[PDB]
Amino acid sequence: SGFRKMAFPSGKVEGCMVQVTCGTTTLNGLWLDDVVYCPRHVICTSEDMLNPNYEDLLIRKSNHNFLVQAGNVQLRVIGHSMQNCVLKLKVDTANPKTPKYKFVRIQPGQTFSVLACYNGSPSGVYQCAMRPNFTIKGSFLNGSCGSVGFNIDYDCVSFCYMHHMELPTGVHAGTDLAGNFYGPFVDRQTAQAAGTDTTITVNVLAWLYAAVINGDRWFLNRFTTTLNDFNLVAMKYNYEPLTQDHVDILGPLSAQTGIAVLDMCASLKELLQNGMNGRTILGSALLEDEFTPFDVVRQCSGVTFQ
Amino acid sequence: SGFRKMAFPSGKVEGCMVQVTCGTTTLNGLWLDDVVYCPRHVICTSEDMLNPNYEDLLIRKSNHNFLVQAGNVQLRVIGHSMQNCVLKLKVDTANPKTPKYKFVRIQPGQTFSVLACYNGSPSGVYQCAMRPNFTIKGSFLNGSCGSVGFNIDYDCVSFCYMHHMELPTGVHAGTDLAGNFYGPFVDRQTAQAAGTDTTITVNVLAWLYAAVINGDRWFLNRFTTTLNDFNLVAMKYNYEPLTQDHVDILGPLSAQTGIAVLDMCASLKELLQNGMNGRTILGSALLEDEFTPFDVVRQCSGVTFQ
Ligand SMILES: *[C@H](O)[C@H](C[C@@H]1CCNC1=O)NC(=O)[C@H](CC(C)(C)C)NC(=O)[C@@H](NC(=O)OCc1ccccc1)C(C)(C)C
Ligand SMILES: *[C@H](O)[C@H](C[C@@H]1CCNC1=O)NC(=O)[C@H](CC(C)(C)C)NC(=O)[C@@H](NC(=O)OCc1ccccc1)C(C)(C)C
């Protein structure tokens, strides 16, 4: 029993963190096989950040302008190319600690773990979600760029995120590992807004099932609702529409608890409409939307990784 | 910017997780050098758990009753001894992945990271605190025993916890790595209560400074308070007494923000007395006591590990 914001073990990713240095920019990079991936604003200076043409900026660079520490040892860059907003530095040594891995581009609502890094050195690990507005609510300081987001899938490190920048509300924007920004953002230091974010309804519901699975039941009710009626009450409270395809993923949880999905919606309904009136769910005084239905099954069932 | 419940990178500890099997009990163990440490209720059966005399139970065992997987490879046990509630199995192979490490016995209020494990295989990592009642609020299923709690200190894995058991309210009880229970608990399956828990005042305050450091200020006030007066308002709200020695640790944060500690107490005061009235701090609708003053400096300053 218990239910915590839980993050994938970070061992496999740590063994891939390297320092990448160009000019007076030092950020983190991901070394997998003989390629090191970092954000391409490692070739920028400060006056370069307001409006750069990275195509230009990078033809002016040579392999020797890329200092790569892996630990105390220096990696020899032998080639570079730019794929969207990531730099792919071909180095002479392949990484012995390279895990089975993939690059995946995740959908908003899905969670991943973040290994926060400075000068190639992990600082911490935490769990995040990809907000409906393609921001992520992270903990990132200067130098944290090139820290990655990832899931694990038994043995396979599935990379979905690289950190690029912080927006003025303190949320964060980055790219998948093939370099493409999640969301309308660019790696320019020009003003950009997050876009009003919404709550991940299907995840709130799964966390309600995490609650039931753990002994918190005070928020349940005899009432049922139609998905059609429920979405009419979720827009009102800035939740995201729940699809039948959500009902299906929420199914195994539904079946494990004996609480049909559409009643867990009728429960959620009343919760938005009344609040919690002192009470907490799973030690949270808030409806919590950063747990996917797979997260809840993971944590409440005991899936491991190797 | 940002502020998340952040856990130490788990790489170094993962490389120490092994499966330990005796009879039909399988739990996790910590392999460091040529010793594997696990809970001593791996020699128990089910009818053994109600009232065992582990001294007896363990003289009846032989080294060959201890099956230890490290990965796919089997460890040869050559000696065992019982220190309090931990078993120290001397194996023939020393662990190549053994990090610089220590065993430390932490005080209530201090935090540590938990690497949750099943059959030697990490499941997740999360951050915890040692509650004032020597329980910890964890996420632990069957087989999770022998999962450890730890801090890192640049390069040194400082081990402070091994998981042993769950109490009927879904909180967790374990031991330091020299085998001694945190709290009045025993590794018997006899009824035991957690003892009413209190809030870690000094940590709530540090998290308030995390809030200030991150742009949340709505809860501040012109008012000041005396520590003596403040403790008179914290007992009322079941917080723990704040000592001058807390004021000193909260000092660097105090100085970094320009908010004298005793005003952050006057802020806390009003918060307990009024609640938050819709608002949140750092995305939490609750005062959050599982961040130490060192955690906040760690996360808000960018200390790393190697
Ligand atoms: C890379 O290590 C660093 C990580 C930052 C530092 C603190 N937290 C982070 O997320 N990223 C950067 O320094 C970014 C560099 C570029 C990607 C090249 C822009 N810069 C920022 O993240 C930057 N954000 C930003 O400029 O865009 C929003 C904006 C808002 C108002 C006006 C202009 C722009 C700041 C960190 C905010 C400077
Ligand atoms: C070891 O892997 C396992 C981890 C448990 C399983 C689910 N969550 C956990 O924390 N630990 C145990 O199975 C414990 C075995 C002993 C340490 C030998 C007792 N058992 C428990 O944790 C046990 N707790 C308990 O018996 O004490 C409280 C109690 C309350 C009422 C009446 C009697 C005792 C249970 C998990 C609750 C069975």
| Distance (Å) from CA B142 to ligand 2 centroid | 9
Report d(CA A292, CA A218) in Å as an integer: 22
| CATH class for the region spanning A201-300 | mainly alpha
Label each residue of chain A as H, E or C: CCCCCCECCCHHHHCCEEEEEECCEEEEEEEECCEEEEEHHHCCCCCCCCCCCHHHHHHCCCHHHCEEEECCEEECEEEEEEECCEEEEEECCCCCCCCCEEECCCCCCCEEEEEEEECCEEEEEEEEECCCCCCECCCCCCCCCCCEEEEEECCEEEEEEEEEEECCCCCEEEECCCCCECCCCCCCCCCCCCCCCCECHHHHHHHHHHHHHCCCCCCCCCCCCCHHHHHHHHCCCCECCCCHHHHHHCHHHHHHHCCCHHHHHHHHHHHHHHCCCCCCECCECCCCCCCCHHHHHHHHHCCCCC
Place of tokens 């559409």: A262
Both tokens of B197, joined, read: 């828990």
Contacts of B142 in chain A (CB under 8 A): 302
Distance CA B101, CA B160 (A): 11
Q: How was this structure determined?
A: X-ray
Of B2, B11, B171, the CB nearest to A14: B11
B238: which 2 tokens? 């079941």
Going by DSSP bridges, is the β-strand pair A148-153/A111-118 parallel, antiparallel, or unpaired? Answer: antiparallel
Q: Dihedral, CA atoms, B249, B253, B258, B263, nearest 10 degrees?
A: -50
What is the signed CA dihedral for A205, A209, A211, A213, rounded to 10 degrees?
-170
Task: Determine, for residues B301 and A141 on separate chains, whether the beta-carbon distance falls below 8 Å.
Answer: yes
B19 with B68: CB under 8 angstroms? yes
Cβ proximity of B69 and B18 under 8 Å:
yes
Expressed in angstroms, the distance from the first to the final Cα of chain A is 23
- Enumerate the residues of chain A whose CB falls inside 8 A of the CB of residue B123: 6, 9, 298-299, 302-305
Beta strands B25-32 and B35-39: pairing type?
Answer: antiparallel
Closest residue by Cα to atom 25, ligand 2, is B189
Q: CB A137: neighbour CB atoms within 10 A?
A: 18
d(CA B163, CA B151): 15
Give residues with Cβ within 8 angstroms of B65, minimum separation 6. Answer: B22, B23, B43
Alpha-helical runs (H) found in chain B: 11-14, 54-59, 201-213, 227-234, 244-249, 251-257, 261-274, 293-301
* A26 vs A301: CA distance, rounded Å: 41
Q: Which two tokens stand for residue B50?
A: 């109600």
Report the atom number in ligand 2 closest to the C-alpha of B145. Answer: 2
Q: Whose CA is nearest to atom 19 of ligand 1?
A: A189
Rounded CA-CA distance A271/A266 in Å is 9
Q: How far is B248 from chain A (nearest CA, A)?
A: 25
How close A289 gets to chain B, by Cα (Å)?
A: 12
Q: What share of residues in chain B are helix, strand, coil (percent, to 5)?
A: 25, 30, 50
Distance, in Å, from the CA atom of B116 to the CA atom of B127, rounded to the nearest integer, reads 11
* H or E stretch covering B102: strand B101-103
Q: Using DSSP, state whether B58 is helix, strand or coil.
A: helix
B91 phi/psi in degrees, rounded to 5: -105, 165
Q: How far apart are CA B303 and CA B152, in angstroms?
A: 11
Contact B123 A301 (CB under 8 A): no
Question: Does the annotation mark B41 as catalytic?
Answer: yes
Sign of CA dihedral B230, B232, B236, B240: positive
Written in H, E and C, the secondary structure of A3-62 is CCCCECCCHHHHCCEEEEEECCEEEEEEEECCEEEEEHHHCCCCCCCCCCCHHHHHHCCC
Ligand 2 centroid vs B191 CA: distance in angstroms? 10
Q: Which residues of A are catalytic?
A: 41, 145
Cα–Cα distance measured from residue B108 to residue B136, given in angstroms and rounded to the nearest whole number: 10
Neighbours of B237 (CB within 10 A): 15
Q: Which residue in A283, A106, A263 sits closest to A177, CA to CA?
A: A106
Residues 6 or more apart whose Cβ sits within 8 Å of residue B219: B208, B211, B267, B270, B271, B276, B279, B281
Which residue's alpha carbon is at the smallest distance from atom 6 of ligand 1? A142
Place of tokens 């954000």: A39
Hey, which residues does A114 pair with through a beta bridge? A126, A149
Among candidates B177, B167, B103, B90, which has minimal Cα distance to B134? B167
Per the listing, tokens 């990713």 go with A13
CATH node for A11-91: 2.40.10.10
> Is the CB of residue A8 less than 8 Å from the CB of residue A299?
no
The shortest C-alpha distance from B56 to chain A (Å) reads 31
Neighbours of A135 (CB within 10 A): 25
Which residue among A10, A140, A301 sits closest to B9, beta carbon to beta carbon? A10
Q: What is the dihedral of CA A256, A257, A261, A266, to 10 degrees?
A: -170
Burial degree of B284 (CB within 10 A; 0-12, 13-18, 19+) = middle
Between chains, do A284 and B280 touch, taking CB under 8 Å as contact? no
Radius of gyration for the alpha carbons in chain B, expressed in angstroms and rounded: 21
Contact B139 A6 (CB under 8 A): yes
Q: Please give the Cα distance from B111 to B160 (Å, whole number).
A: 10
Using the mean position of ligand 1's atoms as its centre, give its distance from the Cα of residue A127 in Å: 21
Locate the chain B residue with the closest alpha carbon to A125.
B7
The number of beta carbons lying within 10 Å of the beta carbon of residue B241 is 13
CB contact under 8 A, B170 and A214: yes
Instruction: Mark out the alpha helices in B65-179 (DSSP H runs).
Output: none
Which residue, among B128, B304, B305, B306, would best test binding to A if mutated, counting the most A CBs under 10 Å from its CB?
A: B304
Give Cβ neighbours of residue A45 (< 8 Å, ≥ 6 apart).
A23, A24, A25
For residue B208, CA distances in Å to A263, B211, B216, B275 come to 38, 5, 9, 14
User: B35: helix, coil or strand?
Assistant: strand
Residue B184 and residue B165 in contact, taking contact as beta carbons nearer than 8 Å: no
Virtual torsion, Cα B71, A15, B32, A124, nearest 10 deg = -120
Sign of CA dihedral B126, A124, B96, A28: positive
- Are A11 and B283 an interchain contact pair (Cβ–Cβ within 8 Å)? no
